[PDB]
Amino acid sequence: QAKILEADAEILKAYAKILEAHAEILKAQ
Amino acid sequence: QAKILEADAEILKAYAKILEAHAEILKAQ
Amino acid sequence: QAKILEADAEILKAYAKILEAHAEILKAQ
Amino acid sequence: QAKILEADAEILKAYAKILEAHAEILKAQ
Amino acid sequence: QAKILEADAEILKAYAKILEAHAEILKAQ
Amino acid sequence: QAKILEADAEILKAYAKILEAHAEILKAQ
Amino acid sequence: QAKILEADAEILKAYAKILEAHAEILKAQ
Amino acid sequence: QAKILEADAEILKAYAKILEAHAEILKAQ
Amino acid sequence: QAKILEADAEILKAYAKILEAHAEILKAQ
Amino acid sequence: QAKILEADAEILKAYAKILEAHAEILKAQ
Amino acid sequence: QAKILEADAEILKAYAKILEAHAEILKAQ
Amino acid sequence: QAKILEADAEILKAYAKILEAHAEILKAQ
Amino acid sequence: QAKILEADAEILKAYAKILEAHAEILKAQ
Amino acid sequence: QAKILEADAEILKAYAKILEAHAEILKAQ
Amino acid sequence: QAKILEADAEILKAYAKILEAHAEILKAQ
Amino acid sequence: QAKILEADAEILKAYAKILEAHAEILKAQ
Amino acid sequence: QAKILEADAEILKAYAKILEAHAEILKAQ
Amino acid sequence: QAKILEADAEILKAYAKILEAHAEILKAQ
Amino acid sequence: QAKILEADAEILKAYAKILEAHAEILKAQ
Amino acid sequence: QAKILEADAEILKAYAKILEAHAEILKAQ
Amino acid sequence: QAKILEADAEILKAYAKILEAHAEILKAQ
Amino acid sequence: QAKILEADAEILKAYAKILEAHAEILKAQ
Amino acid sequence: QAKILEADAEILKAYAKILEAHAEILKAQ
Amino acid sequence: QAKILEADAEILKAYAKILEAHAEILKAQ
Amino acid sequence: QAKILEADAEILKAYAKILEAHAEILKAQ
Amino acid sequence: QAKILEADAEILKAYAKILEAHAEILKAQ
Amino acid sequence: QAKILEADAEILKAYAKILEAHAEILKAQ
Amino acid sequence: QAKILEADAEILKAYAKILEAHAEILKAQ
Amino acid sequence: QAKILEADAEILKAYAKILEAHAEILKAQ
Amino acid sequence: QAKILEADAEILKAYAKILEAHAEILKAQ
Amino acid sequence: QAKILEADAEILKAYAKILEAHAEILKAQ
Amino acid sequence: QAKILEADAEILKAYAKILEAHAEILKAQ
Amino acid sequence: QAKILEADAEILKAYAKILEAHAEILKAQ
Amino acid sequence: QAKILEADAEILKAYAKILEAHAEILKAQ
Amino acid sequence: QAKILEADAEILKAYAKILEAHAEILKAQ
Amino acid sequence: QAKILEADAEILKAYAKILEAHAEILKAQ
Amino acid sequence: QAKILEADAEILKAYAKILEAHAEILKAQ
Amino acid sequence: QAKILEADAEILKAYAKILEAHAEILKAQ
Amino acid sequence: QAKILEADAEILKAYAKILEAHAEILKAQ
Amino acid sequence: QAKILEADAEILKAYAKILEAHAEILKAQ
Amino acid sequence: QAKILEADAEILKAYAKILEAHAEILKAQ
Amino acid sequence: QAKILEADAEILKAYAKILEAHAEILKAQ
Amino acid sequence: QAKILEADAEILKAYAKILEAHAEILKAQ
Amino acid sequence: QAKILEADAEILKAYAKILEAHAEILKAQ
Amino acid sequence: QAKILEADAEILKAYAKILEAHAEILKAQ
Amino acid sequence: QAKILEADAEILKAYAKILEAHAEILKAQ
Amino acid sequence: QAKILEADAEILKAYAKILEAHAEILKAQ
Amino acid sequence: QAKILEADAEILKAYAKILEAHAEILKAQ
Amino acid sequence: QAKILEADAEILKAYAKILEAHAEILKAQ
Amino acid sequence: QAKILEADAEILKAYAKILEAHAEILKAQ
Amino acid sequence: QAKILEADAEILKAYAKILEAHAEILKAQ
Amino acid sequence: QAKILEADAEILKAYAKILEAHAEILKAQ
Amino acid sequence: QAKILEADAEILKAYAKILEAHAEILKAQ
Amino acid sequence: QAKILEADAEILKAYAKILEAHAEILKAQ
Amino acid sequence: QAKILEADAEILKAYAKILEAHAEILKAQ
């Protein structure tokens, strides 16, 4: 079951990388 | 069982990285 | 089922790389 | 049993990182 | 079914590489 | 047995970091 | 079915290599 | 046996950090 | 049908190798 | 034997830090 | 029909190898 | 043997720091 | 032997700091 | 342990509600 | 654990709504 | 140790209630 | 899990709308 | 040692009660 | 999952429109 | 040495009682 | 999937138009 | 040296009694 | 798929035009 | 696919023209 | 409690500084 | 609570500095 | 709340520094 | 909210620095 | 929004540095 | 938006450094 | 657009370094 | 276009390094 | 085009290193 | 063309290394 | 032609290595 | 011709290695 | 002819290895 | 005979690793 | 004979590691 | 012969490490 | 011959380290 | 010849370290 | 020749360190 | 030539350090 | 808080009017 | 906050007018 | 914000006019 | 933003005129 | 932007004229 | 940009004239 | 670009003349 | 380009002359 | 290029003469 | 060298005697 | 050199005697 929660954390970490990239866009403007 | 709790900690750390990314957006604005 | 969620994370990570590339475009201008 | 208590400490440290990120949100505003 | 979503991730990663290449052109000019 | 008491100290240090984060929020308000 | 999408990804990766080569020409000048 | 007493000192130091954090709250209010 | 699109990717990769060869000429001059 | 007495000194020093933290609480009020 | 497009790709790859040999001749001068 | 007497001095200095902390409370009241 | 007498002086200086701490208590009252 | 995951679901639903309120208030702008 | 995935769906739908409102406000510009 | 995890569930539920009240007060604004 | 994939579809459709608005606004320039 | 963990549970439950009262008083605001 | 590939087609059509507008502006130059 | 740990348990229980009284008096406000 | 290949055709046609405009502007030089 | 540790236990028990009486007085307020 | 091959023909014709203009401008040199 | 072969003929004719101009400028040297 | 009365004295001293500044205005005319 | 009265005294001291500055204006003429 | 009143004092102190600057101008003339 | 008022104080402090610079000009003349 | 007002303060501080530089010119003459 | 105003402040700070450098020439003469 | 203004600031900072170097010559004479 | 202005800044920075080197010569004489 | 100006900067930086080397000779004499 | 100017910079950098070597000779003497 | 100038730079770099070696002799004596 | 000059550089680099070896002898003495 | 000069360089490099071996003897003694 | 003495050194080094492991045990307790 | 003396040094260094391990034993207690 | 004296130095250095380890034991007591 | 004297210096430096170790013993007692 | 005198200086520096160690012995007694 | 006189200075500096060490003995006695 | 005179100054400075060390002896007696 | 920023705008507009009057009166001189 | 930026524009325009008056009055000199 | 950049252009043009008048008056000298 | 770059051109042209007048006045000397 | 590079050409020509005047005035010496 | 390269040629010719005059004046010595 | 290489030849000829003057002046010594 | 190689020949001949004069002055020694 | 090889021959002959003079001066010793 | 190994045997025998005394004194405890 | 190794044997025998006397004293305790 541990890999399921690990994949959940990977999903949310990917979401965090999305928001960091969007931040880097908005900083670059 | 310790890997399950470690995965819980990774979930909440991912949530913290989400909130830090959102703060990075709002700081950049 | 964990590989399905891993593939979801790969999709969103690819999306993050898209926005990072768009950031690098707009920063290079 | 030490790894169980270490995982508990990791959980609460992640919670502290959540609250610090919320502080970053509120300070950035 | 995971190979289908993996192929989707490969498609979007290829599109990200397209945008990085276009960034390489625009940076090189 | 010393690692158990070390883990106890890590638990209480994590709790102290929670209260410091809460203080950082309340100072930032 | 997934091999078709893999071939699509190969097409777009080839396009990315085209644009990288064109960038290499333009950088070399 | 010295590591046991050292861990005891770490426990009480953690409690002192808790009380300093609570003081930091009550000063911040 | 996948071999057709694979051959298309081979065509465009050959064109990319042409452009890299032209780059190697222009760099060597 | 010296490390045992050093750990005793660390215990009482931690107790002193506890009382200084309590002093910080009572002073900040 | 895949062998026809494969032969086209081989023609263009041969042209690229011609161009790379011309590059090596020009570089060695 | 000098480290033993040094640790004795550390013990009594720790007791003095306890007593100064209690002094700091009683002054702060 | 000089470090032994130095440690003796450290012992008596620690006792003097105890007496100064008790003095600071009685002054603060 | 299921209460932890249910609380994680409540946290993420609250984050979704905050993002929806942010969405409608940027829609109003 | 399906509540976690449904909350992820709500989060991603909220991000889609934010991006749609951003699309409308860039259409207005 | 289950009391610790249940208290963690109570803590995260309280944080969810705080975030829900924050969502309502941003809905009112 | 189809809600997640439909949310991905909404995300990419919103990105397509943003790219179309960027396309027409570079057409206007 | 189990008394220490039970005291940790009591501490975290009290922190949860404080956070619940803070949630209620922010609900009243 | 056909919505995902349809959104990919919309993305690629948008990239085609951007490249066509870039072609028109380089025609004007 | 178990008396030290039992005294630590009594200290932490007293801190829990103080926190519970603080929770009650913030509930009364 | 015919929309994907049609968008690929549009992309390569746009690249052909860009290369034709580049050929014309090198003819002008 | 066990007298020293027993005296430490008596000290910490006295501090626990002081904190308990402080808890009762704050309960009375 | 014939649109893809026609676009390949357009790309190769554009490359031929670039090479012809390069041949003319080296004829002028 | 006759357009592809005709474009290959145009490419090779352009390479022949480039080699002819290079041979003429080597005759001039 | 002494810090409270000290703060009261600081308030009244600030008030005395206000009246001294008012005397400075009335003298300076 | 003492920091609140300290801040009140800081407000009044700032007001006294305003009146001293206005006095120094009026004296400076 | 103490930081709010501290910031108020900083506002009025900044106004006092403005007034002293105007004083120094008028004295300099 | 405190950072907003702090930024107001920074604005007016910058204004005071402007007037002191004008004073330094007028004194230097 | 605090970073916006901070940037305003940075603008006016840069203006003050311009005026101090002009002062240093006129003093140096 | 804050990066734009920060860049404006960098422009004016660069102007101030130009002016101080010109002052350095004029002082050195 | 921020990188363009940053590059402008870099241009004027380079000009400032030019005048500082010229001042360093004239001071060195 | 940002890299063009960046290269302009590098040109003028190189010129400043020339002048600093000439200063170092004239200082060393 | 940016690499051309970068090469110009490299030329002038090489000239600066020439003059710094001549400074090293003339200082060493 | 850029590699030619890069080679020019390499020539002058080698010349600077010659003069630095001559400086190292004359300094070592 | 670039490799010829690169070889010239290699010749002069070799001469610089000769002079550095001769310097290292004269330093070693 | 470039390989001839490269061989010349190899000759002079061999001479430099000779003098470095001679220096290593003279340093070793 | 380049291999002749390369063999000359190999001769002198072998001579350099002779002198380095002689250095190894003279250092080893 | 050197390998015999080397083996003696390996024997005593193994004994040292035994005692280090025993210290690692006793430290870990 | 050098390897014999080196082996003697290895023996005594192993003895030093024995005494350092015994120091680790005695320090750990 | 230099390796013999070097081995002698290694012997005496090993003896010094023995005495340093013995000092480390005697300090640790 | 310099390596012989260097080895002599290594011998005497090892002797100095012996005396420093014996000093560390005598200081540690 | 310089390395011989450098080795002489190393010999006498080693002798100075011997005398400093002897001094540290006689001071530590 | 400068390294010879530098080594002479190092010899006499080592002699000065000898005399300072002997002074440190005689001061320590 | 400057390094020769610098080495002369280093010789005489070393002589001055000799005389100051002899002063340390003669003062310490 | 918008009244504060509006009053800041009025202040800065008044400073602009004062600077315009100063510009006019220096135009009259 | 746009009034603040417009007031900054008025301020900088007034500074430009002052600099133009300084320019024409140095033109008159 | 275009008024800010336009005022920057006016400031830089005024500085250019000042430098032109300085160039004229140094031409007259 | 072309006004900014045009003002930069005017600034650098004015610096060129100043350097030309300096060149003329050093030609006259 | 060609005015910028033309001004760079004027700057470098002015530096060449200054260097030519320095050359002829060292020729006159 | 040919003016830049011609100015570089003028710079290097001026440096050549400076070095020739330096060669003549070292011929005179 | 041939002017650059010709100026390089002039520079290297000047360095040859400097080395020849150094050669004859060491011949005269 | 042959002027560069001829200048290299002049440089190497000058180095040969310097080495020959060094050989003569070592023959005289 | 034969001048380069002849200069290499002169360099190697000069090294032979230096080694012969070294052989004679070691024959004299 | 047999004296050295016999001294090693005496050293290890003394260590065995010390360990036997430690063994019997832990037997008595 | 046998005197050196014999002195090493005497040193190690003395260390063995010191360890034996230490063993006899630890036996007496």
Numbering used by the authors:
A (entry chain U), B (entry chain O), C (entry chain a), D (entry chain I), E (entry chain g), F (entry chain C), ...: 1 to 29
N (entry chain FA), O (entry chain LA), P (entry chain 9), Q (entry chain RA), R (entry chain 3), S (entry chain XA), ...: 101 to 129
Text lifted from the article:
Here we report seven high-resolution cryo-EM structures of filamentous peptide nanotubes based on a cross-α supramolecular architecture that provide insight into the designability of helical peptide filaments. This local interaction motif, designated as an arginine clasp, is robust within the context of these cross-α assemblies and can guide the coalescence of helical protofilaments into structurally defined cross-α nanotubes. In contrast to most structurally characterized filaments based on synthetic α-helical coiled-coils, the chain axes of the helical protomers are oriented in a plane nearly perpendicular to the long axis of the assembly.
In order to better compare the two models, cryo-EM data were collected on a fresh preparation of Form II filaments. Helical reconstruction afforded an atomic model at 4.2-Å resolution with a different helical symmetry (i.e., a rise of 1.93 Å and a rotation of 124.4°) than that proposed for the original model. A structural comparison of the two assemblies indicated that helical protomers were arranged in four (Form I) or three (Form II) cross-helical stacks (i.e., protofilaments) that self-associated laterally to form single-walled and double-walled nanotubes, respectively. The main distinguishing feature between the Form I and Form II assemblies was the mode of lateral association between the respective cross α-helical stacks. Each nanotube was derived from coalesence of three protofilaments derived from the dimeric protomer. These interactions occurred along the direction of the left-handed 12-start and 11-start helices for 29-20-2 and Form II, respectively, as illustrated in the the helical net diagrams of the corresponding assemblies. Among all three structures, the helices within the dimeric asymmetric unit could be superimposed with only minimal differences. Structural overlays of laterally interacting protofilaments indicated a conservation of the interfaces between the three filament structures.
